[PDB]
Amino acid sequence: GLFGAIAGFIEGGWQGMVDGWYGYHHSNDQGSGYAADKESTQKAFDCITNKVNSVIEKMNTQFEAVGKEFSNLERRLENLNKKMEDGFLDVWTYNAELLVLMENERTLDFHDSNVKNLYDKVRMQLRDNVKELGNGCFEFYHKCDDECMNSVKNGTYDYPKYEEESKLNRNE
């Protein structure tokens, strides 16, 4: 966890999140349920699609081996040809293995950044009207119905609307 979101202060994944990498869970008087974040998931799909298409194109022009025959009096030429092909196959094998290892580290860290950004996006929008529990969840100081919950999910929270009500309950 390079960004501390996955397996960090959010120590467990959700099995109910079936239609997206990232999302929200809300619970109020009306009910509770999950909701995936389609915008952030779509952005993640764009990087992975380009990242894989990048891998294919680069090794598209990889060295190709052709069989040759040499007589018993051409040992130096045969050995020279053998070391050329073996050397090139070793260079390209190293590149293929290293690229996969390096991209896997990036991909896992990229997903970790998305949750931290999504957690911060909600936090900086609910500045004072909620209470931060520290486990990836926010607890409201006012009444937040389904229309209020949906505003948080799509980044249209009206802080001044609940500013007065929240501080009355927060103080006492």
């Epitope: 079936v18 997206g20 389609k38 998931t41 779509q42 799909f45 992975i48 894989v52 298409n53 294919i56």
Partner: nanobody, 120 residues
């Protein structure tokens, strides 16, 4: 350069099922949702259902719930449709449409398959 290839034309009888496939190229793994829409001759296009790219979640139209089953295999990047309990007026041309995103909602059909003619 993205093309969707479907199965061939099929002839069926009422009471049987149909299996229409749609293979998508242009990448190792499928990244866009694929939906199925049909056109009965003399009638307009109707939406049947679709499947999310990786998570495999499927949504079906209320008209065809309980009769259509869309499944995909991540290994081969193929999407199949299973319309069962064939009856009259099920003769139509079925297309597989690729969405602009990974999800069915808020996405439009970038590309369409050539179409398959199925008669009962």
């Amino acid at each position: 350069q993205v093309q969707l290839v479907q199965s061939g034309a099929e002839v069926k009888k009422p009471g049987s099922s149909v299996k229409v496939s749609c293979k998508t190229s242009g990448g190792i793994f499928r990244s866009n949702a694929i939906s199925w829409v049909r056109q009965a001759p003399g009638q307009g296009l109707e939406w049947m259902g679709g499947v999310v790219a990786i998570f495999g979640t499927t949504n079906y139209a209320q008209n065809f719930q309980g009769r259509v089953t869309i499944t995909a295999d991540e290994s081969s990047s193929t999407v199949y449709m299973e319309l069962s309990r064939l009856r009259s007026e099920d003769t139509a041309v079925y297309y597989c449409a690729r969405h602009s995103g990974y999800h069915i909602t808020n996405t439009f059909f970038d590309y369409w398959g050539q179409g398959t003619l199925v008669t009962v």
